[model samples]
Target chain A: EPLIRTTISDDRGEEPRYAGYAASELCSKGYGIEDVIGLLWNKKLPTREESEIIKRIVMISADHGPAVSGAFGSILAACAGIDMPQAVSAGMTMIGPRFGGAVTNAGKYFKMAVEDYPNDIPGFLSWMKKNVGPVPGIGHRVKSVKNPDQRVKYLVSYIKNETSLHTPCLDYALEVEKVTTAKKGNLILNVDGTIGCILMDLDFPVHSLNGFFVLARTIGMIGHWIDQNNQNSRLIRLYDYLINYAVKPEQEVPEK
Target chain B: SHMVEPLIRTTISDDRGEEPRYAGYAASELCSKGYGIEDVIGLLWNKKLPTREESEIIKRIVMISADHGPAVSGAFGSILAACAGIDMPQAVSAGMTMIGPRFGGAVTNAGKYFVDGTIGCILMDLDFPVHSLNGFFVLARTIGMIGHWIDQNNQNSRLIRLYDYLINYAVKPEQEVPEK
Candidate 1:
């Protein structure tokens, strides 16, 4: 047995080969970007139709309005005269459990509900509410029954119509969304909920969905950094009006 | 290929542990003796010390290489990253990614400095027709598919050879990743 267990690689050859396929092979396969991404996620090369759905999922997730911390952070970095990579990394580092970072748990909970309760959406919801507070995929700060998020609707329609070989993870999340929306208007399935359930249907190994958020958002983050650079911004420091400077009395250093 | 012997091998240094002499005198002792920076290299490098002419050449190289444009840009990149608000360590890291030699440098190399001696050094030594990104994507995919690769190998190692022709193909110029 090896002392350290990593399925990663061994330096035996003159050139490294990854997963029995060269990078060149992946390139020349004439497969869409979606096909390659699906290969990474599923370990099976998907059909053209399957790749189209995968492409949509990636395209749909590439951005979430520029107002979010991801874009704003990159903007600040660009204005301060950082080049592309640094500025992009500045935005990427913001991902975490609460914001764009909770994909792992979202994927986990949906999978758990489907595997345990099957179609028993209420039972799953009850178990989740009792055991795990605020179902990771069910609520949204802005989206609701009154002011619907078309993004969620678009993803659901495409996933239901275009995908799903055999799975309840996606459906159960929708069912949960119904129950949540019946009680509260703003409890509609947000992007995270939809992405989580779809990933579960895709059968990603447990806890692997986290990388999707970071990777997908990186594209959008780069756009923001590049846009800021185009404006020729330089040296952004703190704003004078950002703080209540006049309200605070002058203070002296104490020799305690 | 024969193994290359480095000019200054530290492991074989004869240690008079209480006081280590680099050549004939302690390095610290030479520093205290007010020897020039040129002589410092003789103590630092090997027992054979340099003469006056050799020291002048060393000084000239230092002066010429001191302001190599690429390093200056890298330093500026670090400052830029800092202004954006990452801590010291990561800010410098952003600068490092930009300093790669062939991609963006006028000197000995920014890329060669960091990449040489790393595993990537070996990969580049293989003389891939494609640039780095292609190599990296392949490497990352290999890692991601390690379990599958092992499975394939266990079933039949010969199956892996089917990719030999495809792997060695020349890059499509249109699809090339930026050299950096």
Candidate 2:
């Protein structure tokens, strides 16, 4: 369904405005896309710390490279000779469920648990298991309790000690992490979980938490696509070690 | 951008009118007329009815533009998310954010050139010079790249074999295309 209508100006006529603020007027106020973000969000401006956190989160989480799927996808489209919009679409296409998609749900669940269960980690864990299962922000495949995710650790430490914000969702998530790690080594709070909690702490809507993840990775994905055309015109062929394919002999399409 | 009112006047509206249309003709009327997706697509793209050939060509545009593969960045992102058991919508978004000029973005810029049709007309007519041999290696490089994919992405085996074929082609030319 269409959510917006504009009879305010002819289609593509005159300057555009968002949420009643003229685009030029907002820009004159030193507003960037970051400022417009609050408009799309709740039609309000964010605090200094909220803006800083938004900037910092995107920076820390930006393109993690080819084996990182979003950037890898963009590279493939480039090699396939896809022009600008499709290449951008290809990379942008990678931000769903498993990858950067976790950004929102992790914080969302943690905040829910904090609001619902308060100090009871067991109640929160049990609810998560019964309902969503294996909490969104916990568990890492590679990084575990042993080798923690430093990105997450830095963000966690910064929000807790340095920032002037009260982080109830983060506090709840950190407590949940302690219990999960005690059960198993790999069940630590991951980047998705950390970003989710911090964004919630910053007073962002649960839904908007992952947009922070997207903003960060878009920068990184472009770097990869750019590198492919330059000295790093490096043709990315996957190595032979982790490889296997093909199930049956070739055959023509079967008739319906 | 919450909508306060509908854009189109419709007979479907209970307290107001009678003959309810979507784009133009009533929905029931179009359904009764036996028109389907092709009619809908043509309506949106142009008011003029597409020729029989025009319909297939536009269909072919979609036919060829499907995702490259799971190995490519865009599809790969979704596949990774799907593997991790994320919901389908979020999994799909993982693949969506990667689009831009350096990657999938090249398609739109390149699209204007191809749809302009002169290149396709020349190729269809076999208009290239028979007596030509200048910029042959550029042609060979592309063929080798496609050849490897045919052999498949996995295996040092297929790649090694193709590498032999390509280096030999690099050192010794079998065919050519005119550069200038």
Candidate 3:
């Protein structure tokens, strides 16, 4: 299988065009990579003013904290002295439902419930509990007392202060909070909850929600990989003894 | 030597802003030289400028490939690089090193799967009857299988349209032939 073809140039002289266009402008016009690239190759580069604003938005979402699964996977791989790709892949593989991807699922569930039951909090709460087994976005292992994601707060403030039509992820979080409190007790929305709200507000395809995290995590992973180089570890492997002791073959249970 | 000098100088420049500015200037020059957007589009896709139809095809391909699920290896490599305290480029390269087959194979694998199904529709005389496979479940399951499922009630209709377009038009008959 071949990877999807994307244009790349080694020479800066030959670089694609629309890289400098304002994302806000591109997004507003429903522009995608092709349009942006077309503009880049054909039109005048965006003025410095436009590029600066785009850079700020990109940088804001560039790196999160150390707890991201990709970051952890990179750390573990580097410690093992595996080459870059192996370590990176190890980290990325950890990003499925159990790790970085959980927030998107939580967001989807929350969105469904809120949209379906804008009123009737009790009915909504019941529906969530019945279908998803618990509130999707609450409860975090870290930051047990309060959500540590500063981005959530930033987006919440931005939405409330900046635009009336803004649909931040925090809105969905607040909706979940209302229902959860009304049903069970106090359950705060975490970073995933907040990001889910912001993603929804941006009208991002639900599928792309995790892609944003991947982009951010890429920044963090690079940071970790650099750190691993500094440590100069030889090989970092886990012990199998952690799961010790196979039972006798005769004692094995029969198949259902 | 003139082109190489500018490329090397720009590539080695520490300031990221300058690189993009140079790129923008180059694009402006291309436009100023009486090159239409269509010509530039062709230049990007092929070495030569493309026709309107070719440009449209390129546009669709770009949209499809712009984002895939969050890539695991890239993230892991970057974080590992950061932890090792390497420079940004070194760390980025570390992540890039892992972008080969085993680590990031799914995009290619899934594309193959989709293409194969499309080819089956065209060359194998296979029927994709309307609602043959519950569009809801098939779309839901495929995206969900890739862990990208979104629970929109109207998603099925939209997916059906996409399926119809790809099967009826986007795929070429020769492109749909099966392997021996």
Top candidate when judged by DockQ against the true structure: 3
Better of 1 and 3 by TM-score: 1
- Residue B108 error, candidate 1, Å: 18
Residue by residue across A145-176, what tens digits does model 1's lDDT show?
98776666766765667655555777777778
The per-model lDDT (C-alpha) reads 0.49, 0.49, 0.41
- DockQ of each candidate, alpha-carbon based: 0.02, 0.03, 0.04
Q: Give me the TM-scores for chain A across all models, comma-separated.
A: 0.83, 0.81, 0.66
State TM-scores per candidate.
0.56, 0.53, 0.47
Rank all candidate structures by their TM-score, best first, as comma-separated numbers: 1, 2, 3
Flag regions of model 3 displaced more than 4 Å. A1-14, A17-68, A142-151, A163-165, A182-186, A239-243, A246-256, B1-180
Q: Candidate 1 chain B TM?
A: 0.36
Q: lDDT, candidate 1, residue B61? A: 30
* True contact recovery of candidate 1: 0.02
- Give the alpha carbon lDDT tens digit for every residue of B53-102 in model 2: 55444333321222233344544454455445554334445555444444
Better of 1 and 3 by lDDT: 1
How well does candidate 1 score on lDDT at residue A57?
Answer: 53
In candidate 3, what are the lDDT values of residues B4-33, reduced to their tens digit? 211001110011221111112232234334
**Candidate 1, superposed: residue stretches over 4 Å from native:** A1-16, A40-42, A244-251, A254-256, B1-180
